[PDB]
Amino acid sequence: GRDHTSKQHVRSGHRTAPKSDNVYLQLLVKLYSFLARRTDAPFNKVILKSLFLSKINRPPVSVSRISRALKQKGAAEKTIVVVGTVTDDNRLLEFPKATIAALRFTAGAKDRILKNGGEAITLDQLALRAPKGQNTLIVRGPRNSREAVRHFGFGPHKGKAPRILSKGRKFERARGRRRSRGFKV
Amino acid sequence: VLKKNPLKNKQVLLRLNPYAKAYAAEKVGSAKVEQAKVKPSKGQFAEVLKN
Amino acid sequence: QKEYTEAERSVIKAKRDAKASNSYYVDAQPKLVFVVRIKGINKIPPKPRKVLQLLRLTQINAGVFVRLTKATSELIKLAEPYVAYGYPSLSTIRQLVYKRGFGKVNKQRIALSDNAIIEANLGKFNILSIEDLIHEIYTVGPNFKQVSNFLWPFKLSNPNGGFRARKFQHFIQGGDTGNREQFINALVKQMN
Amino acid sequence: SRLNEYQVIGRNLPTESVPEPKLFRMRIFAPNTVVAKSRYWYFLQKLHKVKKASGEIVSVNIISEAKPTKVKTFGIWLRYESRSGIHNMYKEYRDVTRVGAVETMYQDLAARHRARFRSIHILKVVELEKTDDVKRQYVKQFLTKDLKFPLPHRVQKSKKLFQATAPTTFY
Amino acid sequence: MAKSKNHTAHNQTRKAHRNGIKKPKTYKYPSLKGVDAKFKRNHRYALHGTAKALAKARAEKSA
Amino acid sequence: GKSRGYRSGTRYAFQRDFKKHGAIPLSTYLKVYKVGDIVDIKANGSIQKGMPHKYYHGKTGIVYNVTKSSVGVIINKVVGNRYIEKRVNLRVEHVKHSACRQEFLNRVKSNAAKKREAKANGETVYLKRQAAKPRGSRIISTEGNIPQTLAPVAYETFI
RNA sequence: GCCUAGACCGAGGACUGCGGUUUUUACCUAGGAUGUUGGCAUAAUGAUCUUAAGUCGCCCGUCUUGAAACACGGACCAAGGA
RNA sequence: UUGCUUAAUUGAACGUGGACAAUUGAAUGAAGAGCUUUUAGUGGGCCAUUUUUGGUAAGCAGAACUGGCGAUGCGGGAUGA
RNA sequence: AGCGUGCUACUUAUACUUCACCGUGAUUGCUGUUUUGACGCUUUCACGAGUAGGCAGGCGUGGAGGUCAGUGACGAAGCCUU
């Protein structure tokens, strides 16, 4: 017998492989499993983990975020790495010239990058021109902007959104939401 | 693949403790101590007998 | 080895001289204790259970070295009804480390079969050999914490010859728990 | 138990107010020095304001018998607890060693009074030099001139289960 | 007919210590909720002015 | 009829000390509390305004708000399996500075004072506190202190 | 330090290591059993089934704090059956 | 810095800049820490030590702390949650 | 072969120690020898009770798309059988 100070036979709780069965996504894991194992660069181990992430943990990165990242001091010529989809943003007034490496580009996002003299490469082409991820800048999309997060942790005095089907004056606005109808929480 | 006890295996003992050879060569485990024959209890400590 | 021998001879000489000059030589209190958990893992109150977990005594017949201070003494007092502890001799420490010495390397129990294993994990504390480790344990040194935590808790067997008739009572009243102070060596010889 | 006689000397822990505390000595009959030092504190705390935490053990020494091969009669003064109260007795023993007579005492009071080791305090163990110091008849009868006695009805311990010859008890 | 157990705290500390008892996290900047409004009102101007002063300070050594 | 009012069970906790009734000495009203100070809570029965609940009697916390006659104290209370920060408004009569700060603040200055000197003298010094170690060897001299022999005493009734 | 009696096991499968003797770019007891001999291959050996012996073994499902229960359902079998 | 505060250049709060490095300031330990979503069953309990209320008491009724049984076999108590 | 007490040896749990094998979790390494398996191979260490319940990997039945140019009147399917 043993006095177990912790729970036994506990899995790490992290993804060790992609849930997807895309054969091409698995070639990227194969390529970055080798680089993470054989290079000892911190960038390689970060990319390998991001390839495992689910869809909601890889939110789209707009072409505006990349614009804002390229505007950092000394980051105008860094290689933008996005493990996910790069989408278009019609709100931009101008886009610079830069190389962006991404899993996927929308038609609009790819168009604007090329129209401004930039280059849209995939993550395998990145491993050629940067096997160590030299001079890169990883950009991630906003995770908490998802609509499902609005309702997480709903409760009294929390300020989260109720899980409701219809919005209007007759739908959960009277008692508990108004001090004229009893109380407000 | 197999732990060997240095207290049974001489080669493992020499591998771990090179000084062991000297300890055996100098008979350190049975070394005499040179001293005179003295009895320092004849005085007051003889109150162990009675007090 | 030379300093062990000279320390013993100096202590004996001091005792003899104090006997000569109508004095009394009071020996230095022990600075190291060996603690063996001799009680199973069932029906333990929360406080001694937590104390035993902090001493890394998570199984029966498991032994560990503890440097005696007020804090650790009060720790051991809470675990007294479940452990037997005492002041170990040098030969006991050497036999323990040689036969049952394992180090904690990357949270793995690795046998101390070569001085390279000890060096790779305790070189920054100037421990280059099994003898360096034994010396650090015996004469409780500056790096005692690291060396003792590097040692995996010793896994002794049941005594050859058994315990007394009933264990779970204090050694003073014919049991086995508590402090026996030099008889830890006979027990460890039974158990190692 | 199987006992030894120990000298234990102790004192209060030195204080800046009291820098040379008085040394106290006791003769303790214990199986080992771990119990001997424990029994010492047990009797000091019954006689003086001291504890193990606030005190110090100075010396522990075995007291060997002066004349281990000389037959003596020991008078022992006792203080034991019964189921009802606390009593004093004085009992006498014939033995060659001071320790063994105490060992006889512990067996004796267990047999005749159901008194456990924890229930007994030995106030004093004294050698009886003179014959008139003997008060108890169960030891006085062995001090007579030219004492002889046979051992009738000798029982011989047999190694085998079956003996082919009739048993005998001569001696 | 329905006399049952009224109340007990038996097993309640065990359930508390399975995942607890977790201490609250500390942060460099605690919230100013419940702080006196007069101090809170003034603390706004003091921080606003400090940001202006630094912005000028970084201006002289930048361009 | 169970009763669980606000001040239930405070018969002795909210009593004044023996021969300490009446007016409050004004050192209470002269002490200065700053946000971030560590203070002890001890309800004074003679002031019924700004009185803490009986739970906070004897608890220590951090001052986070200072008002005209009160301080806001933060207490962590175990509610189930976690702690909750409680924000209690207390008149300063119920509040006292915690003395645990000053001893540690002294050690902060003492440690710095000792450390800078060791650099000055070209040596090094160890600043961590140490638990009381077992005592070293010593020699007991017996001039005037020949050991007294003690024996257990006979039983005797003393009524 | 030395001698000495017995029991159980032999995972691994080119080399790599740490040591020792160095008489040596050699050998070793030093990162896990080999050598030799006899017998058998119409069999020594192993497995299963039936049975004897020794020892242990209360009738399942269920509700229940608690079932072998003198609590309830169940004679048996097939097919259907949530 | 402030519109708060002071008779005030006093403060209060937040800062700029500078010094103090592995004894960065007790012990021991750490199959790592933190965070989130979602959902199951459960919401009849009982027993032992110790504290304890009602009762003459109860294999009675009701509480406190811990450990157990339930949910658990195994060695001992012949048999037994 | 009772009671009190002490000692010596001895008996044996699914407990402990060493070893083997299984699984789970973690962990070492593996593409200029990656070579037709990298959802793989490989090194090491620890762990293994379990109702209600949860999750994972599998086994089996009727029918469907593809494939085995599959089996079969020289005997399919079914059924019985140390």
PDB file of C-alpha atoms in Angstrom, chain F residues 23-128:
ATOM      1  CA  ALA F  23     -14.229  56.164  28.511  1.00  0.00           C
ATOM      2  CA  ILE F  24     -11.702  55.236  25.831  1.00  0.00           C
ATOM      3  CA  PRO F  25      -8.132  56.534  26.189  1.00  0.00           C
ATOM      4  CA  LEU F  26      -7.430  58.917  23.340  1.00  0.00           C
ATOM      5  CA  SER F  27      -4.346  57.139  22.013  1.00  0.00           C
ATOM      6  CA  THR F  28      -6.965  55.112  20.143  1.00  0.00           C
ATOM      7  CA  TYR F  29      -8.175  58.220  18.313  1.00  0.00           C
ATOM      8  CA  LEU F  30      -4.643  59.503  17.707  1.00  0.00           C
ATOM      9  CA  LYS F  31      -3.218  56.510  15.854  1.00  0.00           C
ATOM     10  CA  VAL F  32      -2.912  56.941  12.099  1.00  0.00           C
ATOM     11  CA  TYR F  33      -3.931  54.168   9.710  1.00  0.00           C
ATOM     12  CA  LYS F  34      -2.783  54.142   6.097  1.00  0.00           C
ATOM     13  CA  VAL F  35      -4.115  52.060   3.234  1.00  0.00           C
ATOM     14  CA  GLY F  36      -2.147  48.830   3.285  1.00  0.00           C
ATOM     15  CA  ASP F  37      -1.570  48.694   7.041  1.00  0.00           C
ATOM     16  CA  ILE F  38      -2.067  45.472   8.986  1.00  0.00           C
ATOM     17  CA  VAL F  39      -4.538  45.928  11.836  1.00  0.00           C
ATOM     18  CA  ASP F  40      -6.159  43.721  14.442  1.00  0.00           C
ATOM     19  CA  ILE F  41      -9.902  43.709  15.050  1.00  0.00           C
ATOM     20  CA  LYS F  42     -11.267  43.652  18.593  1.00  0.00           C
ATOM     21  CA  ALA F  43     -14.797  44.906  19.142  1.00  0.00           C
ATOM     22  CA  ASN F  44     -15.202  47.471  21.912  1.00  0.00           C
ATOM     23  CA  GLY F  45     -18.563  47.039  23.604  1.00  0.00           C
ATOM     24  CA  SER F  46     -18.918  50.673  24.651  1.00  0.00           C
ATOM     25  CA  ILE F  47     -19.097  51.878  21.032  1.00  0.00           C
ATOM     26  CA  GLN F  48     -22.081  50.351  19.270  1.00  0.00           C
ATOM     27  CA  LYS F  49     -21.590  52.235  16.009  1.00  0.00           C
ATOM     28  CA  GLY F  50     -19.225  50.824  13.421  1.00  0.00           C
ATOM     29  CA  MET F  51     -19.038  47.558  15.343  1.00  0.00           C
ATOM     30  CA  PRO F  52     -17.744  44.434  13.573  1.00  0.00           C
ATOM     31  CA  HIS F  53     -19.669  41.211  13.460  1.00  0.00           C
ATOM     32  CA  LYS F  54     -18.644  38.595  16.011  1.00  0.00           C
ATOM     33  CA  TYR F  55     -16.818  36.595  13.334  1.00  0.00           C
ATOM     34  CA  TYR F  56     -14.269  39.359  12.785  1.00  0.00           C
ATOM     35  CA  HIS F  57     -13.527  39.688  16.498  1.00  0.00           C
ATOM     36  CA  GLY F  58      -9.882  38.675  16.746  1.00  0.00           C
ATOM     37  CA  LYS F  59      -9.115  38.602  13.018  1.00  0.00           C
ATOM     38  CA  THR F  60      -6.285  40.486  11.334  1.00  0.00           C
ATOM     39  CA  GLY F  61      -6.580  42.298   8.032  1.00  0.00           C
ATOM     40  CA  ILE F  62      -5.346  44.962   5.618  1.00  0.00           C
ATOM     41  CA  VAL F  63      -6.709  48.495   5.668  1.00  0.00           C
ATOM     42  CA  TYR F  64      -7.934  49.410   2.197  1.00  0.00           C
ATOM     43  CA  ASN F  65     -10.096  52.502   2.797  1.00  0.00           C
ATOM     44  CA  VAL F  66      -9.868  55.377   5.279  1.00  0.00           C
ATOM     45  CA  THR F  67     -12.912  57.538   6.010  1.00  0.00           C
ATOM     46  CA  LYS F  68     -13.781  60.236   8.537  1.00  0.00           C
ATOM     47  CA  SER F  69     -13.996  58.005  11.614  1.00  0.00           C
ATOM     48  CA  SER F  70     -13.467  54.513  10.208  1.00  0.00           C
ATOM     49  CA  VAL F  71     -11.208  52.241   8.201  1.00  0.00           C
ATOM     50  CA  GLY F  72     -12.098  49.601   5.646  1.00  0.00           C
ATOM     51  CA  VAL F  73     -10.454  46.292   6.492  1.00  0.00           C
ATOM     52  CA  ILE F  74     -10.070  43.274   4.213  1.00  0.00           C
ATOM     53  CA  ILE F  75     -10.541  39.817   5.730  1.00  0.00           C
ATOM     54  CA  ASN F  76     -10.377  36.444   3.997  1.00  0.00           C
ATOM     55  CA  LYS F  77     -13.141  34.161   5.264  1.00  0.00           C
ATOM     56  CA  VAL F  78     -13.485  30.446   4.557  1.00  0.00           C
ATOM     57  CA  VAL F  79     -16.901  29.844   2.984  1.00  0.00           C
ATOM     58  CA  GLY F  80     -17.029  26.202   1.966  1.00  0.00           C
ATOM     59  CA  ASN F  81     -14.015  25.128  -0.073  1.00  0.00           C
ATOM     60  CA  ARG F  82     -12.557  28.565  -0.814  1.00  0.00           C
ATOM     61  CA  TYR F  83     -11.847  31.962   0.716  1.00  0.00           C
ATOM     62  CA  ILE F  84     -13.921  35.090   0.149  1.00  0.00           C
ATOM     63  CA  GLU F  85     -12.540  38.579   0.679  1.00  0.00           C
ATOM     64  CA  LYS F  86     -14.775  40.457   3.100  1.00  0.00           C
ATOM     65  CA  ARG F  87     -14.752  44.252   3.258  1.00  0.00           C
ATOM     66  CA  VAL F  88     -15.662  45.394   6.773  1.00  0.00           C
ATOM     67  CA  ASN F  89     -16.196  49.009   7.826  1.00  0.00           C
ATOM     68  CA  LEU F  90     -14.909  49.537  11.365  1.00  0.00           C
ATOM     69  CA  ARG F  91     -14.713  52.570  13.585  1.00  0.00           C
ATOM     70  CA  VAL F  92     -11.135  52.977  14.766  1.00  0.00           C
ATOM     71  CA  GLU F  93     -12.150  52.185  18.347  1.00  0.00           C
ATOM     72  CA  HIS F  94     -12.473  48.529  17.308  1.00  0.00           C
ATOM     73  CA  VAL F  95      -9.137  48.478  15.481  1.00  0.00           C
ATOM     74  CA  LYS F  96      -5.516  48.282  16.610  1.00  0.00           C
ATOM     75  CA  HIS F  97      -2.239  48.107  14.719  1.00  0.00           C
ATOM     76  CA  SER F  98      -0.861  44.606  14.310  1.00  0.00           C
ATOM     77  CA  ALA F  99       2.471  44.230  16.089  1.00  0.00           C
ATOM     78  CA  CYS F 100       3.609  41.474  13.709  1.00  0.00           C
ATOM     79  CA  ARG F 101       4.661  44.123  11.180  1.00  0.00           C
ATOM     80  CA  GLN F 102       7.123  45.949  13.392  1.00  0.00           C
ATOM     81  CA  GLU F 103       9.252  42.944  14.331  1.00  0.00           C
ATOM     82  CA  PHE F 104       9.604  41.981  10.668  1.00  0.00           C
ATOM     83  CA  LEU F 105      10.157  45.562   9.530  1.00  0.00           C
ATOM     84  CA  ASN F 106      12.952  45.755  12.101  1.00  0.00           C
ATOM     85  CA  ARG F 107      14.526  42.628  10.621  1.00  0.00           C
ATOM     86  CA  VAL F 108      14.339  44.172   7.150  1.00  0.00           C
ATOM     87  CA  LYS F 109      16.388  47.141   8.324  1.00  0.00           C
ATOM     88  CA  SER F 110      18.607  44.988  10.535  1.00  0.00           C
ATOM     89  CA  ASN F 111      19.347  42.612   7.662  1.00  0.00           C
ATOM     90  CA  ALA F 112      20.276  45.463   5.325  1.00  0.00           C
ATOM     91  CA  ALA F 113      22.471  47.051   7.993  1.00  0.00           C
ATOM     92  CA  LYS F 114      24.367  43.808   8.560  1.00  0.00           C
ATOM     93  CA  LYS F 115      24.615  42.964   4.861  1.00  0.00           C
ATOM     94  CA  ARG F 116      26.100  46.274   3.704  1.00  0.00           C
ATOM     95  CA  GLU F 117      28.778  46.071   6.395  1.00  0.00           C
ATOM     96  CA  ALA F 118      29.857  42.611   5.236  1.00  0.00           C
ATOM     97  CA  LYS F 119      30.421  44.071   1.776  1.00  0.00           C
ATOM     98  CA  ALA F 120      32.407  46.891   3.383  1.00  0.00           C
ATOM     99  CA  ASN F 121      34.627  44.470   5.314  1.00  0.00           C
ATOM    100  CA  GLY F 122      35.124  42.266   2.257  1.00  0.00           C
ATOM    101  CA  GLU F 123      33.375  39.274   3.822  1.00  0.00           C
ATOM    102  CA  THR F 124      30.022  37.509   3.475  1.00  0.00           C
ATOM    103  CA  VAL F 125      27.247  36.960   6.012  1.00  0.00           C
ATOM    104  CA  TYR F 126      24.261  34.603   6.152  1.00  0.00           C
ATOM    105  CA  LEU F 127      20.975  36.324   6.952  1.00  0.00           C
ATOM    106  CA  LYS F 128      18.424  33.500   7.203  1.00  0.00           C
TER     107      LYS F 128
END
